[PDB]
From Swiss-Prot, chain A:
Shown chain mapped onto the complete sequence: 276 to 279 of 471
Biological source species: Escherichia coli (strain K12)
Family per record: Belongs to the alkaline phosphatase family.
Subunit organization: Isozymes 1 and 3 are a dimer of identical chains, isozyme 2 is a dimer of heterogeneous chains, one of each of the subunits from isozymes 1 and 3.
Subcellular location: Periplasm
Name of the coding gene: phoA
Protein name: Alkaline phosphatase
Swiss-Prot record, chain B:
Quaternary structure annotation from Swiss-Prot or TrEMBL: In pull-down experiments interacts with CedA.
Modification comment: Autophosphorylated; GrpE inhibits the autophosphorylation.
Family from the record: Belongs to the heat shock protein 70 family.
Name assigned to this protein: Chaperone protein DnaK
Phylogenetic classification of the source organism: Bacteria, Pseudomonadati, Pseudomonadota, Gammaproteobacteria, Enterobacterales
Subcellular compartments: Cytoplasm; Cell inner membrane
Modified residues (N6-acetyllysine): 33, 168
Shown part of the complete sequence: 389 to 603 of 638
Effect of residue 67 to D: In dnaK756(TS); confers temperature sensitivity
Amino acid sequence: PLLG
Amino acid sequence: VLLLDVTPLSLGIETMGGVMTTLIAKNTTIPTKHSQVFSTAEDNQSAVTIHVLQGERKRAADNKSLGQFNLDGINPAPRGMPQIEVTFDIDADGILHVSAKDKNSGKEQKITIKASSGLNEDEIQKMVRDAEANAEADRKFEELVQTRNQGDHLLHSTRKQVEEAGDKLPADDKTAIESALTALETALKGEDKAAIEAKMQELAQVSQKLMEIAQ
């Protein structure tokens, strides 16, 4: 559920 | 009705590891609105890239790019704490509105994607064909990205806990844990699922005192  | 307007392919975004996370599933009837809350990959991250994807492949790179856009102005925080709500909204006219809202800083950024964007009737069948053709490979990639994000979580959480611990941790434990974290960081760069799990296992075998202290 993480974005860079 | 004799007719349904439906999505021929999954719509979603790229998440950490270059995976497609689906917000609107294949064969969804329009109009439709779905949202999911995402967070930051790194400590003190000031912005997210929203990369919008159409397709059925697990690898972000193997799907059709509908566009991307940034949401800046994220306030300094530990990774995983900011709440970035992503909304995909397809109206009656088949236009896709994508929004990212920071639930702290209230900031919003959108991209609008015309009903005509993305893959043509043929490319859709070629994409659906590839999904099922490369299904085994997409599973293997999926559990490598899972393994990688578990190792990255273990790396980051362990460094945090070594610090909170300070003098409480025997020198012997710290040397052993420090060596294992270096070895795990190195293996996380690579592609070898087995080598990541081996370094994760080393860190867990040597970390028992640190885990007691983190109590």
